[PDB]
């Protein structure tokens, strides 16, 4: 089967700057004359893989300019003069040659934006879940970059450890941020035993770590 | 305009069967051959096959040794993938595309099914809110296996600045998420902000809302 290598993996680019992706087969995708079945791919988060670029250079339907593809034989590659917020997603590329159909492992292409802050939020558990025997605390860190932060539980200002899990979404399509949430579970009876609960926030976009928090009972 | 409607989500046993259906609409159906193509959690596009409507003849992924069925019925144009000995390793989203010779290659997509290969029982979540110048709000969607659960902002109307966050699995074995939005303090009175909740493998469908 048709081994279809993809680099680079990963791929960093500032607003308004050109990205390039480049395809390798293991044996030749000329198919006849004028036709070389190679493909390119964009699958953005959670969504399907929607074609850019059929037949080595052929632009889909809506496809801007901006996107090229060239390449002949085993050498392939995808080209984006100005890439935008709008690109963030996992690149493809396929050959529908020769059975069976095969595609690249992929390329991330992440954004390269300004520093920005994270805006902080902190909800407590809902009387309704409290009912169940389980506390959920919730710390939001909304619309960052880059990706790296700190978020430190505290409770009665004692630093909690174990007791948290976290998620982060993937890049903004339009702002190209990156927001995350942190989930401190803790009983029912643990929950009633404190009064403060906070959130701190270490991030590059803040001078000095942010701490957001509520009163128990409140 | 064309499209390819995939059947909901599910959990199924190791070693059963699944059957994974694709409606298509707004083209003639006999005249476009149809492909599935799987892919694993963080994982890339795998191809598993290929149907000819027009005459069902099929072509498939020999990695696959058997276990995949590709059929097609015109009447109500669609076709199915059947997938048999569920292995832990066909734990995957399963995509029907439309392939043309023109392009030679797949253009329109079904939005995917996850098929889970799991021996747990199917859960339905529990919805919890989180209450509150620019103000945030949200969901609490706990405790549901499998995945996905979908979540949507005042019945499907709002989308900007809506953060539904990946799940996370718990140490219970239980899938939990939450789903966040960026909005004003003034309008949090003015519109009710109902958070809509959907779990297909468990047909829960949960509207709670998000009160102060």
């Known amino acids: 089967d048709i081994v279809m290598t993809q680099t680079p993996l990963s791929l960093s680019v500032t607003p308004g700057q050109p990205a390039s992706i480049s395809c390798r087969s293991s044996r030749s995708l000329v198919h006849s004359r004028g036709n070389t079945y190679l493909h390119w791919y964009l699958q953005k988060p959670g969504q399907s893989p929607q074609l850019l670029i059929y037949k080595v250079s052929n632009r889909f339907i809506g496809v801007p300019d901006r996107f090229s593809g060239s390449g002949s034989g085993t050498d392939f590659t995808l080209k984006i003069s100005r890439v935008e917020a709008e690109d963030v997603g996992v690149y493809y590329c396929?050959?529908?040659?020769?059975?069976?159909?095969?595609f690249g492992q992929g390329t991330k292409l992440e954004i390269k934006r300004t520093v920005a802050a994270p805006s902080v939020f902190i909800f407590p558990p809902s009387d309704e879940q409290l009912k169940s025997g389980t506390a959920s605390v919730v710390c939001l860190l909304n619309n960052f970059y880059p990706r790296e932060a700190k978020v430190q539980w505290k409770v009665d200002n004692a630093l909690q450890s174990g007791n948290s899990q976290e998620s982060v979404t993937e890049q903004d399509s339009k702002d190209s941020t990156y927001s995350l949430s942190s989930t401190l579970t803790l009983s029912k009876a643990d929950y009633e035993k404190h009064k403060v609960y906070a959130c701190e926030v270490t991030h590059q976009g803040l001078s000095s770590p942010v701490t957001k928090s509520f009163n128990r009972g409140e | 305009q064309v499209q390819l409607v995939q059947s909901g989500a599910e959990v199924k046993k190791p070693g059963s069967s699944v059957k994974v259906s694709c409606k298509a609409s707004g083209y003639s159906f006999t005249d476009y051959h149809i492909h599935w193509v799987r892919q694993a959690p963080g994982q890339g596009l795998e191809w598993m096959g290929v149907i000819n409507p027009m005459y069902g003849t099929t072509d498939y992924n020999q990695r696959f040794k058997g276990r995949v069925t590709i059929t097609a019925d015109e009447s109500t144009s669609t076709a199915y993938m059947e997938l048999s000995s569920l292995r832990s390793e066909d734990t995957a989203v399963y995509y029907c595309?439309?392939?043309?010779?023109?392009?030679?290659?797949?253009?329109?997509w079904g939005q995917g099914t996850l098929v889970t290969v799991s021996s747990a029982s199917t859960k339905g979540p529990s919805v919890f809110p989180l209450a509150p110048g620019t103000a945030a709000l949200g969901c609490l969607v706990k405790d549901y296996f499998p995945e996905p659960v979908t979540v949507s902002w005042n019945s499907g109307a709002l989308t900007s600045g809506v953060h539904t966050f990946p799940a996370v699995l718990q140490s219970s074995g239980l899938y939990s998420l939450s789903s966040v939005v960026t909005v004003p303090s003034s309008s949090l009175g003015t519109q009710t902000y109902i958070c809509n909740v959907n779990h297909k493998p468990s047909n829960t469908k949960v509207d709670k809302k998000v009160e102060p």
């Open positions: 595309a439309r392939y043309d010779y023109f392009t030679g290659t797949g253009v329109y």
């Open positions: 396929s050959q529908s040659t020769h059975l069976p159909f095969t």
